[PDB]
């Protein structure tokens, strides 16, 4: 199937309390494999996946060295953006950067993306053509102007179309045992009477991978999305994910409701009935 | 691999 590699950056300024805090994490699909915390003791790119351990010491030296340059680059960007918005010099602000590339089942390049944010709002994003930028406010025009004159779109494209997918394919081959397999959900249903007149019926999905999953209730075939409690897909902590879905039922009409589990690890969709 | 181009905002 399709695959992706993404890197998440968070730079939060700490005026007076020291140096801006920089956090970087790298994901292959839904599996984290690198880490960097500017406040960590090691001050190095740390491995977070078993299949990335085999990379040589030159790998960890360069990624640690390169990711530090991003924190240094973001350091001046916090100050530069404060002047754009005329913000207080003591206030704390955050810059978020997300970039990566996607590949298909054949391993060929599919799409690359690069997006930047400031204080939780979109600031500037590289368009899907990898040749133009999208500015979110007037302050972004300044960054867009400075990046257009610096051929930033070409430089980022040289990575997304180049070294990004090349190392994406290398990671997938190295982690075939863990990245290219699917874990089907461990589904079961539970019963909870609210009172002696109504009851709550919950459908469970345990220990599945990847995150994408669909759980739907049906009353005699009719979807009950309006009368349904849905919780966000959540991590179990062991690389697998969890999700449960509820519906309120009459005392004697449990059999009228069925829960449907849709997941790419299941060859056929499951139907759960009480 | 890290590939973020730090042109500068």
């Amino acid at each position: 199937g399709s695959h992706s590699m993404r890197y998440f950056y968070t730079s939060v300024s700490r005026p007076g309390r020291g140096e801006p805090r920089f956090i970087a994490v790298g994901y292959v699909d839904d599996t984290q494999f690198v880490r960097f915390d500017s406040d960590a003791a090691s001050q190095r790119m740390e491995p977070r996946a078993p299949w990335i351990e085999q990379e040589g010491p030159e790998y960890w030296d360069q990624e640690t060295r390169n990711v530090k340059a991003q924190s240094q680059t973001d350091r001046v960007d916090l100050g530069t953006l404060r002047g754009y918005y005329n913000q207080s010099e003591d206030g704390s602000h955050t810059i978020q950067i997300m970039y990566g590339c996607d590949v298909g089942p054949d391993g060929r390049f599919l799409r690359g993306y690069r997006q930047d944010a400031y204080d939780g709002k979109d600031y500037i994003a590289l368009n899907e053509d990898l040749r133009s930028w999208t500015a979110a406010d007037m302050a972004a025009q300044i960054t867009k102007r400075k990046w257009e004159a610096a051929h930033a779109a070409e430089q980022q494209r040289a990575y997304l179309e180049g070294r990004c997918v090349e190392w994406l394919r290398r990671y997938l081959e190295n982690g075939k045992e863990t990245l290219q397999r699917t874990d089907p959900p461990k589904t079961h249903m539970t019963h909870h009477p609210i009172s002696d007149h109504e009851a709550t019926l919950r459908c469970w999905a345990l220990g599945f991978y990847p995150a994408e999953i669909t759980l739907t209730w049906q009353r005699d075939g009719e979807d009950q999305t309006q009368d349904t409690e849905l919780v966000e897909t959540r991590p179990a902590g062991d690389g697998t994910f969890q999700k449960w879905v509820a519906v309120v039922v009459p005392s004697g009409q449990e059999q009228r409701y069925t829960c449907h589990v849709q997941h790419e690890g299941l060859p056929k969709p499951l139907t759960l009935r009480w | 691999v890290v590939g973020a181009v730090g042109v500068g905002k």
Partner: antibody, heavy 109, light 111 residues
Framework: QKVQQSPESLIVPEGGMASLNCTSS?????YFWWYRQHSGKSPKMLM???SNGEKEEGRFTVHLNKASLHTSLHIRDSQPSDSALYLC??????????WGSGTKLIIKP | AVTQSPRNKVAVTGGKVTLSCNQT?????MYWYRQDTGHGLRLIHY???????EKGDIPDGYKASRPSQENFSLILELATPSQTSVYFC???????????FGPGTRLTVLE
């Protein structure tokens, strides 16, 4: 060296075509550059390439074959102002530039 | 642009020589190369930002300092005849399109 550059020196008459070549012994290279350095001056970039194919900007043509890690610089209608040292730069996995020995272009007026 | 000082210097073996580089392009990265016939440009030191310096391909016998975002100095604690070369300063960005080169410093060290 990590980047091999040839020819070492070249003599071409006015109006002739000057063709240079550059090869990197490092397989983990994604970007290439050509800088022009006149004698006793700072080297300025001519142009860049990171994808297979040609790239024409005026009298200058740049080719790249990432499979063979080879770049070529071609100058049409050579002028005496083109007599300068030409440097080839390749980008490391550390995003650092690796520099070749340089090619001396001599144009006889 | 990028400026360097001094442009020409004659040094004694065992002496101290400092070269200062200034850039107004407000780039994040500053570099110190040396150009020698047969070697091209060889990186000596570079700085990803203010207050931090990194060793290059040939950092031996050379020291660097980055007090501010604009200034980046190369310090030669004990000049040697092998250090007689032409030194160039570059400013650029991590994945930058171009590296902007200073005018260059011609240093001659004599015993």
């Amino acid at each position: 060296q990590k980047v091999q550059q040839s020819p070492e020196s070249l003599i071409v008459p006015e109006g002739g075509m000057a063709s240079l070549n550059c090869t990197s012994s490092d397989r983990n290279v994604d970007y290439f550059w050509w800088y022009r350095q006149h004698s006793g001056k700072s080297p300025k970039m001519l142009m860049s390439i990171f994808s297979n194919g040609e790239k024409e900007e005026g009298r200058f043509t740049v080719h790249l074959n990432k499979a063979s890690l080879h770049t070529s610089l071609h100058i049409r209608d050579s002028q005496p102002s083109d007599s300068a040292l030409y440097l080839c730069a390749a980008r490391d996995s550390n995003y650092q530039l690796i520099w070749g020995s340089g090619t001396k272009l001599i144009i006889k007026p | 642009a990028v400026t360097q000082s001094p442009r020409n210097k004659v040094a004694v073996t065992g002496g101290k020589v400092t070269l200062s580089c200034n850039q107004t392009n407000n780039h994040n990265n500053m570099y110190w190369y040396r150009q020698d016939t047969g070697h091209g440009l060889r990186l000596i030191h570079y700085s990803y930002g203010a207050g931090s310096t990194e060793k290059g391909d040939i950092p031996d016998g050379y020291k660097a300092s980055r007090p501010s975002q604009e200034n980046f100095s190369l310090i030669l604690e004990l000049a040697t005849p092998s250090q007689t070369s032409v030194y160039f300063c570059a400013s650029g960005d991590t994945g930058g399109y171009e590296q902007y080169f200073g005018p260059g410093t011609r240093l001659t060290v004599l015993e």
